[PDB]
From Swiss-Prot, chain A:
The chain holds residues 676 to 764 of 806 of the full protein. It is linked to Inclusion body myopathy with early-onset Paget disease with or without frontotemporal dementia 1: An autosomal dominant disease characterized by disabling muscle weakness clinically resembling to limb girdle muscular dystrophy, osteolytic bone lesions consistent with Paget disease, and premature frontotemporal dementia. Clinical features show incomplete penetrance. Frontotemporal dementia and/or amyotrophic lateral sclerosis 6: A neurodegenerative disorder characterized by frontotemporal dementia and/or amyotrophic lateral sclerosis in affected individuals. There is high intrafamilial variation. Frontotemporal dementia (FTD) is characterized by frontal and temporal lobe atrophy associated with neuronal loss, gliosis, and dementia. Patients exhibit progressive changes in social, behavioral, and/or language function. The gene is VCP. This is Transitional endoplasmic reticulum ATPase. Homohexamer. Forms a ring-shaped particle of 12.5 nm diameter, that displays 6-fold radial symmetry. Part of a ternary complex containing STX5A, NSFL1C and VCP. NSFL1C forms a homotrimer that binds to one end of a VCP homohexamer. The complex binds to membranes enriched in phosphatidylethanolamine-containing lipids and promotes Golgi membrane fusion. Binds to a heterodimer of NPLOC4 and UFD1, binding to this heterodimer inhibits Golgi-membrane fusion. Interaction with VCIP135 leads to dissociation of the complex via ATP hydrolysis by VCP. The modification N6-acetyllysine is found at K79. Necessary for the fragmentation of Golgi stacks during mitosis and for their reassembly after mitosis. Involved in the formation of the transitional endoplasmic reticulum (tER). The transfer of membranes from the endoplasmic reticulum to the Golgi apparatus occurs via 50-70 nm transition vesicles which derive from part-rough, part-smooth transitional elements of the endoplasmic reticulum (tER). Vesicle budding from the tER is an ATP-dependent process. The PIM (PUB-interaction motif) motif mediates interaction with the PUB domain of RNF31. It is found in: Cytoplasm, Cytosol; Endoplasmic reticulum; Nucleus; Cytoplasm, Stress granule.
Amino acid sequence: AKMTNGFSGADLTEICQRACKLAIRESIESEIRRERERQTNPSAMEVEEDDPVPEIRRDHFEEAMRFARRSVSDNDIRKYEMFAQTLQQ
Amino acid sequence: AKMTNGFSGADLTEICQRACKLAIRESIESEIRRERERQTNPSAMEVEEDDPVPEIRRDHFEEAMRFARRSVSDNDIRKYEMFAQTLQQSR
């Protein structure tokens, strides 16, 4: 929250959503690599080894919120506070 | 009245209505507090107090007039006076 001064709800939701996209990409690429190595080496994975967990990790969020967008500008706040001061009498 | 210079009738009605909101706020909060007490101590009132009779104090009016709006502007009166003078002179 401290780093995200001046960020609306939409930006926070987008930041949260991007990390899940990265996690899905990682999981799918790992699954495809595992499937390829199953083709290369038959019977090498007779036992159903557990797939990568939902490792929504610090690095995922770090790379996701690198593209942090200031959706709302700064001049809007002065406009709204000027209108409020006009209301205040 | 001497402190309401440049005030419209609608603004004065709004100011009068404002204090009743504070009165209702006070009454509801006080009765909620009171029922918070006597739901723990069963019927402990040696002196009999009814629902607080409407007794809106000077503090409510002071708070209400602290937030007053001059809806009529200082240029509108000048424009109306100019139009009145135009009516007097032209026709």
